[PDB]
């Protein structure tokens, strides 16, 4: 998820 | 004296965005976890391309090695965190109990808990020998972005969407502390200070903060890099110079003077956001790791 916002 | 970081090595291997990069406590390794599902190893000094671990459904969003370098923890979308033998690459156990996206993870400097934050607005803690959960807290409102063990592991520090960082007894699960301004971003991540009498948290109002909790007093803010949309990794440099580095979402590494709050250095090179940074326990070094358009690590070396 930390990758995408 | 500004630090003078130059670029070591570009490691490529991830085949999506780089979510984090940790040192292990010892110095020799260096361990990524990426939106590929994946743990990378690397060697922190020649960058040499190690393992890979695997195991995970879903991406990983974070990574976390014990005191004596020998396991991970690892915090993923698929609702789990995993801990790996290091040198075996083997699952040792699965934490089932979260109900959303594990976003962080760390281990306590005795490395028998494991401390997770969740999507699912919680933040748990777990055995590290049993890998049952010990406690759930009803940490906040909105997704955990940051947890963190004090020096001693005494004391939890969380930050979330909902625009809280809280302090937390570790032994007794008690919050101690709610930390808020008068205006509430979203805190996107938060870690001690070396000496657990400060707590460094990032806002996505694209500020960084060095935070007196006991007294509820704002010491430092740091400025001029770019985080609205992600959640970034910061830290404190202390093998040389007294810096804070942060990730940011020009492609570019930030460092600042933590006492004058000056911007002393600017990394260029990544080509998406740095979404993670780490500084080398003993050497002036350090890790950074970008976003889809990039999916590297640079291992950079400074003289201060």
């Given at each position: 998820?930390?990758?995408?916002? | 004296?500004?630090?003078?970081?130059a670029?070591?090595?570009?490691?490529?291997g991830?085949?999506?965005?780089?979510?984090?990069?940790?040192?292990?406590?010892?110095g020799?390794?260096?361990?990524?976890?990426?939106?590929?599902?994946?743990?990378?190893?690397?060697?922190?000094?020649?960058?040499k391309?190690?393992?890979?671990?695997?195991?995970?459904?879903?991406?990983?969003?974070?990574?976390?090695?014990s005191?004596?370098?020998?396991?991970?923890?690892?915090?993923?979308?698929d609702?789990?965190?995993?801990?790996?033998?290091?040198?075996?690459?083997?699952?040792?156990?699965?934490?089932?109990?979260?109900?959303?996206?594990?976003?962080?993870?760390?281990?306590?400097?005795?490395?028998?808990?494991?401390?997770?934050?969740?999507?699912?607005?919680?933040?748990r803690?777990?055995?590290?020998?049993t890998?049952?959960?010990?406690?759930?807290?009803?940490?906040?409102?909105?997704?955990?972005?940051?947890?963190?063990?004090?020096?001693?592991?005494?004391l939890?520090?969380?930050?979330?969407?909902?625009?809280?960082?809280?302090?937390?007894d570790?032994?007794?699960?008690?919050?101690?502390?709610?930390?808020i301004?008068?205006?509430?971003?979203?805190?996107?991540?938060?870690?001690?200070?070396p000496?657990?009498?400060?707590?460094?948290?990032?806002?996505?109002?694209?500020?960084?903060?060095?935070?007196?909790?006991?007294?509820?007093?704002?010491?430092?803010t740091?400025?001029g890099?770019?985080?609205?949309?992600?959640?970034?990794?910061?830290?404190?440099?202390?093998?040389?110079?007294?810096?804070?580095?942060?990730?940011?979402?020009?492609?570019?590494?930030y460092?600042?003077?933590?006492?004058?709050?000056?911007?002393?250095?600017?990394?260029?090179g990544?080509t998406?956001?740095?979404?993670?940074?780490?500084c080398?326990?003993?050497?002036?070094?350090?890790?950074?790791?970008?976003?889809?358009?990039?999916?590297?690590?640079?291992?950079?070396?400074?003289?201060?």
């Amino acid at each position: 998820a930390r990758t995408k916002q | 004296v500004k630090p003078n970081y130059a670029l070591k090595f570009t490691l490529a291997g991830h085949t999506k965005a780089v979510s984090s990069v940790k040192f292990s406590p010892n110095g020799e390794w260096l361990a990524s976890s990426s939106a590929d599902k994946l743990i990378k190893i690397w060697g922190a000094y020649d960058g040499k391309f190690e393992k890979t671990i695997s195991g995970h459904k879903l991406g990983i969003s974070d990574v976390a090695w014990s005191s004596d370098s020998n396991l991970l923890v690892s915090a993923s979308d698929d609702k789990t965190l995993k801990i790996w033998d290091v040198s075996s690459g083997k699952c040792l156990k699965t934490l089932k109990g979260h109900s959303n996206y594990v976003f962080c993870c760390n281990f306590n400097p005795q490395s028998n808990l494991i401390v997770s934050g969740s999507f699912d607005e919680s933040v748990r803690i777990w055995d590290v020998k049993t890998g049952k959960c010990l406690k759930t807290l009803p940490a906040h409102s909105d997704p955990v972005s940051a947890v963190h063990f004090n020096r001693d592991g005494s004391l939890i520090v969380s930050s979330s969407y909902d625009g809280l960082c809280r302090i937390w007894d570790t032994a007794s699960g008690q919050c101690l502390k709610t930390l808020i301004d008068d205006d509430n971003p979203p805190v996107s991540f938060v870690k001690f200070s070396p000496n657990g009498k400060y707590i460094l948290a990032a806002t996505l109002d694209n500020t960084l903060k060095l935070w007196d909790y006991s007294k509820g007093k704002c010491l430092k803010t740091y400025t001029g890099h770019k985080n609205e949309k992600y959640c970034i990794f910061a830290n404190f440099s202390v093998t040389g110079g007294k810096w804070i580095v942060s990730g940011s979402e020009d492609n570019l590494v930030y460092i600042w003077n933590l006492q004058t709050k000056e911007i002393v250095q600017k990394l260029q090179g990544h080509t998406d956001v740095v979404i993670s940074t780490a500084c080398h326990p003993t050497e002036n070094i350090i890790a950074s790791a970008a976003l889809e358009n990039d999916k590297t690590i640079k291992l950079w070396k400074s003289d201060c």
